[PDB]
Design a protein around this ligand. Structure first.
Ligand SMILES: Cc1cc2nc3c(=O)[nH]c(=O)nc-3n(C[C@H](O)[C@H](O)[C@H](O)COP(=O)(O)O)c2cc1C
Ligand SMILES: Cc1cc2nc3c(=O)[nH]c(=O)nc-3n(C[C@H](O)[C@H](O)[C@H](O)COP(=O)(O)O)c2cc1C
Ligand SMILES: Cc1cc2nc3c(=O)[nH]c(=O)nc-3n(C[C@H](O)[C@H](O)[C@H](O)COP(=O)(O)O)c2cc1C
Ligand SMILES: Cc1cc2nc3c(=O)[nH]c(=O)nc-3n(C[C@H](O)[C@H](O)[C@H](O)COP(=O)(O)O)c2cc1C
Ligand SMILES: Cc1cc2nc3c(=O)[nH]c(=O)nc-3n(C[C@H](O)[C@H](O)[C@H](O)COP(=O)(O)O)c2cc1C
Ligand SMILES: Cc1cc2nc3c(=O)[nH]c(=O)nc-3n(C[C@H](O)[C@H](O)[C@H](O)COP(=O)(O)O)c2cc1C
Ligand SMILES: C=C(O[C@@H]1CC(C(=O)O)=C[C@@H](OP(=O)(O)O)[C@H]1O)C(=O)O
Ligand SMILES: C=C(O[C@@H]1CC(C(=O)O)=C[C@@H](OP(=O)(O)O)[C@H]1O)C(=O)O
Ligand SMILES: C=C(O[C@@H]1CC(C(=O)O)=C[C@@H](OP(=O)(O)O)[C@H]1O)C(=O)O
Ligand SMILES: C=C(O[C@@H]1CC(C(=O)O)=C[C@@H](OP(=O)(O)O)[C@H]1O)C(=O)O
Lengths: 388, 388, 388, 388
């Protein structure tokens, strides 16, 4: 299974094509819209998010509620585009109008300047329009399709904020994936423990009044995973490593870690390995989950636990120093529309990207031209695993 | 450029094939051997590291001291194989001899059990032989070819330990890559500040007496990096993300971060973006390097700064709890030859892997059938960059 | 450069995304539409070709006349979809309405039955809608983008029919690419010598009235190609082999050959090899082009000459024998809407696919994040080639 | 599954690494060696083939007679290397010695000149050593591993010469794969009709005394093929097209065709489609096999029938004009002893590459981390197919 996303922030619309989903999967637009809606939200996002109402339009690969195995195409319109018809026209317009919203003041922390050097642009809007996170809308759309697959295979996934601009959220011990998703869904900041709900909001508004931005750490958990997805025989077959690329490819993300993660570099061997247990009732399991679901680049059957750090949004309403690309003189950075933080939204993109890599791995490991054989292949493999 | 590594820990030899290096790159067995030697070192490694004397043998693609563009084949013999001629024989032997060194007690933390389930093994040695970090020897070897290409393009790379089993190393501000390489080579634990050298060493010794293991955090730095390598136009073209997959693919790595890394989730935007500066003498630069060389998934010209966390080595001489796979009874894990720590060596592995990806990215971006045209494409791009 | 095509024959629309085209390439909807029009033509096409008027819509990656380097999305609407609103709805509909246009009598030669076994379909139109050649419309839209790149690099391409249902064309010797393009465009069956045009039209009418079909052989020729695209150093880098996959992947194609092709298996070495020549004026050239522009899987600078055989359309109006997948009784294949032949269109698809593969090979060989750098590299390479 | 081949014709040895073969496959050196012996054979092959005695050495991935799922490494020594130790040494040597056997006279029909332009060589030996068909030895080694997988899945493969230097071999009607395999290797020229055996040998001799070369056409046939391998959903998923690239990648191959092949462009649809039949005994079948086992890029369950044309060996005793690359002066190329033909050996290479691609497709289609699950999946899939 593979895919490509396309579209510009202020273009007419976004598009994604997914090639390789099995035939037979029940799939509706509501299956996608629920996640699209979750991605637009989170306390701290404003502006564009109150202008868009992201919903999907399928134009291929889905027939009468089920996929057919053909490429699936999903669209999401940009309502805002009616204000950028000339500026973002595909066709040429007269010289004289091109100057409009032309960007020559790169913003620190964004792709503007380097995208201009690489692609040799005279207008950095040509870097901005694609590098913008509006694109994550289609990543979530692809992840919602991936999630339908995981749901048919009795797997569960959830995401929650565990660090918000420095505030470490004390998560209760031994929550199920279902509990994580339900608690988190009740918060406007995706935290499982809310006595901090009002405290974090206040802070986002401080930061907001203060004219600054914050980021944090988001955690994705996956339950019911089959054992032996990924492989140690070659470096690029390791599933944790595959997930690492996908997480870090999310706009603003600067790191990814599994289970204890970086803490594992501060502890002893005996405090980190997860002992192996067996029962006639359940077959193999592990006493603890410090490795976050992976042994040797492979799923061991415990929950997958991965965290990603999102740096603060680069756009500051209180600029920062930059340089004017036409004069080479220092100046403040351009101020494009943005928010004090988009962390909860980033955690939804993270959930979608993890689900997507997972679904890719499942489709590669098991017979999967169609849902029936895949579901059969997975049941058989879970029976084998249980009785090993 | 692409490659495959092969070989078992106690098989006769390790092998690697590299396809796609440009013709005309000066390359010698000593260019490789220097790094193989580093990989074998580091206070805390014993056993095998005194038996093996890792050196390469070229058998294709190198002629008269230069690559030809054809596939390069490198071999590294396993001197230890002499003690395993029967056990690791490619051809069938007497059934009665097959139980030798057979493993039925998986080790927590290692690939034993899950590899056994995935591949349907009755002898967990079949997992161990290939999941062993003995394979990282060939990754270092491929890395040494990649480093020669970086050297030809005026780039420099180094690695050092910045956290050793929880002891954080105090790194002097403003060191060049060359100083980090030089100071680290004077330490038995690869730290650039030897004030904790004896303390780290005695800590290792304690760990070993205590019968436990420790990991840490290694940092790789790359200097003189061309701008605009990597792209934001699609997620899987982001170079930070490609490095992420490669770093976490290293045995025992549970995480990866760039620049400030996870600490960016604890700061404000104004304390994280790197301001943009310009001078007639140097072109564009950045005031600070909190982003570790990456904006928008692309190199910004600042030093690339990446860290990976190595969990503690799973094999404890004081074995943890497990299960006998033939009887399903609880039992202590198998105790195989291992060391209290392999962090310094992991650092070298990371250095090679980072270099590998980077050379791959350079070979994608520039005309690179031969070194001549590659060097010219790179100089020309550097000139463009400098004058943007 | 990579791309995906998507869409069903009777769904709402077709879509394609191309990822990786350099920034800076002039591109308009007319650059695409000219080839979409060619593809709908050819004496012998009717039905659908009378309902559709294929024209593109760009929704991403194109701004004010040029590419930006971001993913390019193209749509082609299916006007006919208004007749299939229920039959092809993405949303589920009442069970009884699903019998509408349901295929249970598979057509010999088409993807019907096999797709039904592979994907576990009960309705074989689910095989039909995606396997149908309506999809070639988007492969031609991608080729048109590829062809714009080839034109900025001073390359030319043309296609022509050389066999039309067994009638071989007597092709004058030593025509240029441009001559081929011009002469074939003045013919209603894309033949460059019209002595048999009326005979071929009369034959097509005959096949039609008899409820039969015909295919033939088309030839694509590419001029001005750079030397050394492709490589012999690994089998999958050979450019003639890469083209071979792309040509056979066109619907109804059953084979591909280069230069003399299969005739080379009937002649002696001395009658096939192309002698090497050199002059201060032209640099290296070849006396003849029996090899069709390739030596060792690499372009040698002569015209690329490649031929593909298109088998006859499978859907015959006097249907062949098949089986009712519901009762297992013998029954005549279903008769869907089809032409007696679509060879001239198939020629345009083949021109597009060849140009695509070649653009991809060029983008891989040369620095090509943007058009300016790509043009400078190709000029430089041509300079080195001429003066070798 | 993927693999890389490496080595020079006059280097010390050839090497291949295959990654992704399921654990559990019985495999021995003789499994490979049988094919390697066939590949050295064929009337018309002389020189080298009498010195070389190709046998494989396994150095990884094979233990006690079975694969383990890790990367497999195979070596084949070049006995001829002994006469080239200086010339082909990896390490640098005195400048005065580097001109030994330097090549500056490109052979028409070979990779020489174009390779030296591409890779900017002064010595065309660096093109020649790797472009040589000596490399096909490792492609046949790889194909032998693939063939072992096919045999475990009850599939059979064979190759025979159908056209020899223009002599069309009259093949009996409807030979099975096993018949073709048996008859063909009773022949020193791989033909299934031995009334023409002496005739072809004499013709080969005649060509040789005439100082010329011949090529021809080889047909590979595959039986017991599962249905539904390959897909129509995207062009690059079609298995006929994947086989096309593999076949045209063989040195000297200039075309590939399936079933009736190019003859399908001369016939009518009624004379080409294969009618679909069903019986309670055997399930679905076809009345004829004009399509060569493919419908919509997918296997239909009839025997795969593919033919490739091999141009004649380019090196001749008859003169062919070329140019001296150091002087730009014309010269006549002539080789006193060259083989007149390598067609029967090319047929072995064709069988191997075909077998390889099929194994790859099978590994992709079905659950295949280990042989046991693969077998189970294939069995389940044939039961579904038969009972559709
Ligand atoms: C959900 C989400 C929303 C974002 N919103 C904004 C925003 O409003 N303003 C901004 O400057 N960056 C925003 N970002 C961050 C930028 O897209 C990103 O920092 C930039 O493209 C550079 O890529 P990099 O930070 O990964 O290096 C957002 C990211 C995510 C995941
Ligand atoms: C058991 C343990 C676990 C820790 N885990 C991490 C970690 O995962 N990430 C990190 O950045 N620091 C980690 N450290 C470092 C401590 O957080 C650090 O010493 C502390 O925050 C004080 O920092 P300061 O000296 O910079 O104020 C940990 C320390 C210990 C003892
Ligand atoms: C240089 C290096 C040396 C290692 N040496 C050991 C060792 O002696 N014993 C051990 O159990 N693990 C060692 N490992 C770690 C194991 O290979 C590894 O934990 C195991 O394959 C499971 O992979 P994972 O930890 O990535 O999940 C080493 C890793 C590296 C990078
Ligand atoms: C400014 C700041 C930065 C921090 N950076 C990190 C970090 O990068 N990684 C991490 O794991 N913890 C980080 N933390 C947490 C501290 O390391 C500290 O040890 C933490 O509060 C844990 O203490 P506890 O786990 O005993 O409550 C940071 C804390 C602060 C105030
Ligand atoms: C331009 C074009 C038009 C075609 N139109 C038709 C048609 O009208 N009816 C039909 O049965 N097949 C048509 N085909 C062929 C089928 O799509 C094709 O034979 C089928 O998908 C099975 O694929 P295969 O022939 O490659 O095995 C056409 C092919 C091309 C290139
Ligand atoms: C089995 C085999 C043996 C070959 N032996 C010879 C040979 O002895 N001499 C020769 O000139 N070409 C020989 N060839 C052909 C060349 O390798 C080939 O023409 C050349 O590398 C250029 O590639 P191309 O013909 O695919 O363009 C052989 C090919 C094969 C498959
Ligand atoms: C549109 C989204 O976020 C955008 C991401 C973003 C940026 O630079 O990354 C900039 C803003 O877009 P705009 O300037 O139109 O307000 C964000 O709002 C979205 O998530 O759908
Ligand atoms: C051989 C190396 O490391 C090995 C990696 C390792 C493991 O499980 O990862 C186990 C030990 O191997 P053995 O049991 O033979 O001593 C390590 O020493 C090496 O780095 O070259
Ligand atoms: C639509 C095209 O070709 C179609 C390919 C086709 C088939 O089996 O391949 C069937 C017909 O479509 P329909 O049944 O609507 O008339 C063809 O005309 C086209 O070239 O644009
Ligand atoms: C060595 C093989 O074939 C070789 C292929 C070949 C060529 O250009 O392709 C040239 C000859 O090599 P040389 O000139 O040393 O004899 C062939 O013999 C072989 O099949 O193993």
């Amino acid at each position: 299974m593979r895919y490509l996303t396309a579209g510009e922030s202020h273009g007419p619309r976004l598009t994604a094509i997914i090639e390789g989903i099995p035939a037979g999967l029940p799939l509706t637009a509501e299956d996608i819209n629920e996640d699209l809606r979750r991605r637009q939200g989170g306390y701290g996002r404003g502006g564009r998010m109150k202008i868009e109402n992201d919903q999907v339009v399928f134009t291929s690969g889905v027939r009468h509620g089920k996929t057919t195995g053909a490429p699936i195409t999903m669209d999401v319109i940009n309502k805002d585009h009616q204000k950028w018809l000339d500026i973002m026209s595909a066709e040429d317009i007269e010289d004289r109008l091109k100057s409009k919203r032309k960007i020559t003041h790169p913003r620190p922390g964004h792709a503007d300047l380097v995208g201009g050097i690489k692609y040799r642009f005279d207008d950095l809007r040509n870097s901005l329009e694609r590098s913008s996170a509006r694109e994550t809308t289609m990543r979530v759309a692809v992840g919602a399709v991936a999630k339908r697959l995981l749901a048919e295979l009795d797997m569960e996934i959830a995401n929650h904020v565990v660090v918000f601009g420095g505030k470490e959220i004390d998560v209760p011990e031994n929550l199920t994936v279902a509990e994580i998703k339900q608690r988190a869904a009740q918060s406007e900041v995706s935290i499982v423990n809310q006595e901090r709900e009002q405290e974090i909001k206040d802070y986002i508004d401080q930061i907001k009044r203060d004219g600054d931005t914050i980021g944090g750490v988001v955690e994705t958990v996956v339950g019911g995973v089959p054992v032996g997805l990924g492989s140690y025989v070659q470096w690029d077959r390791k599933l944790d490593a595959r997930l690492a690329q996908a997480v870090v490819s999310i706009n603003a993300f600067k790191g990814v870690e599994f289970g204890l993660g970086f803490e594992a570099g501060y502890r002893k061997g005996s405090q980190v390995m997860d002992e192996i247990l067996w029962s006639k009732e359940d077959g193999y399991t592990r006493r603890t989950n410090n490795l976050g679901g992976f042994e040797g680049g492979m799923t061991n059957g415990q929950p997958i636990v991965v965290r990603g750090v999102m740096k603060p949004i680069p756009t500051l309403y209180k600029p920062l120093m930059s340089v004017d690309i036409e004069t080479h003189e220092p100046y403040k950075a351009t101020v494009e529309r943005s928010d004090p933080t988009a962390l909860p939204a980033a955690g939804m993109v993270m959930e979608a990207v993890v689900a997507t890599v997972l679904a890719q791995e499942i489709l590669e490991k098991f017979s999967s031209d169609n849902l029936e054989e895949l579901k059969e292949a997975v049941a058989k493999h879970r029976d084998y695993t249980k009785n090993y």
